[PDB]
């Protein structure tokens, strides 16, 4: 019993972290097989960072402009390409610790673990959601760039995020492992701002199902709702609209607790309207939107405490 923001064990990822230096900029990279990936802004000095041209800054570098240390051992660079907003460095050693892995782009609302690193050296692990406005509420200091986000499905590491920058809001922006940003952001120090965000409706509902599976029922009520009547209410409280696809994803959690989705929306409709009455759901005095339905199936018991 219990319910925590749980991250994936990080070992398989720790073995791919390295440090990458260019001039006097140092950040982290990820070493898979014989390639090291990192943000391309590693080739910038502070002056460059306001108006960089990467095509043009990169041709002014050779392989030996890049230092790659893994622990103690120096890795020699023998190749370099730009890929969108990342670099790819071919090196002379293949990483003996390369795990089974793949790269996926994730969708807003989805969730993942972040391994925070400084100077190629893992410092911590925590669990995140990709926000609707495409930021993350991470925790990062200077030198954290090239820290990655991931999931584990069985034996396989799904890399989905690389850290590039921090917004004025204090939130973070980055990239998939192909170099394509999440969001409208660009790797430059200019005026740039998070779009306004929204609460992840699908997730809140997942989290209410988790409360019930754990054996708490107080927030339920006897009503039902039409999808459209819910959405009229959702829009006024800045929630994402619920769609039919979202309703279908909540199927097995519906099946496990015998609560119909639309009954649960009615429950939420009520919580939004009347507050919680200074009470808690799974420990929280607020409605929690950073567990997906999948996050709830994995952590929770397959048997409801009825």
């Amino acid at each position: 019993s219990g319910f925590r923001k749980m991250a994936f064990p990080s070992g398989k990822v720790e073995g791919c972290m390295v440090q990458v230096t260019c001039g006097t900029t140092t950040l982290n990279g990820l070493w898979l097989d014989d390639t090291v990936y990192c943000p391309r802004h590693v080739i910038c000095t502070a002056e460059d960072m306001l108006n960089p041209n990467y095509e043009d800054l990169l041709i002014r570098k050779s392989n030996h402009s890049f230092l790659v240390q893994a622990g103690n051992v120096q890795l020699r660079v023998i190749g370099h390409s730009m890929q969108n907003c990342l670099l790819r460095l071919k090196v002379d050693t293949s990483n003996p610790k390369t795990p089974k892995y793949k790269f996926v782009r994730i969708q807003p609302g989805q969730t993942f673990s972040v391994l925070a690193c400084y100077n190629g050296s893992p410092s911590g692990v925590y669990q995140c959601a990709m926000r609707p406005n495409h930021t993350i509420k991470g925790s990062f200091l200077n030198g954290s760039c090239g820290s990655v986000g991931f999931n584990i499905d069985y034996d396989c590491v799904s890399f989905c995020y690389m850290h590039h920058m921090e917004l004025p809001t204090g939130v973070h922006a980055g990239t998939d492992l192909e170099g394509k940003f999440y969001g409208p952001f660009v790797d430059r120090q200019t005026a740039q701002a998070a779009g306004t965000d929204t609460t992840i409706t699908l997730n809140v509902l997942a989290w209410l199902y988790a409360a019930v599976i754990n054996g708490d029922r107080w927030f339920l009520n006897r009503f039902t709702t039409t999808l459209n009547d819910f959405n009229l209410v959702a829009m006024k409280y800045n929630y994402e609209p619920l769609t039919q696809d979202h309703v279908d994803i909540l199927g097995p959690l519906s099946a496990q607790t015998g609560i119909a989705v639309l009954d649960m929306c009615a429950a939420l409709k009520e919580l939004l309207q009347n507050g919680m009455n200074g009470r808690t759901i799974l420990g929280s005095t607020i409605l929690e939107d950073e567990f997906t339905p999948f996050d709830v199936v994995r952590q929770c018991s397959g048997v409801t405490f009825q």
Binding site: H41, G143, C145, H164, M165, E166, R188, Q189, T190
Partner: peptide, 5 residues
């Protein structure tokens, strides 16, 4: 502004 890290 914006801070690359």
């Amino acid at each position: 502004e914006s801070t690359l890290q």
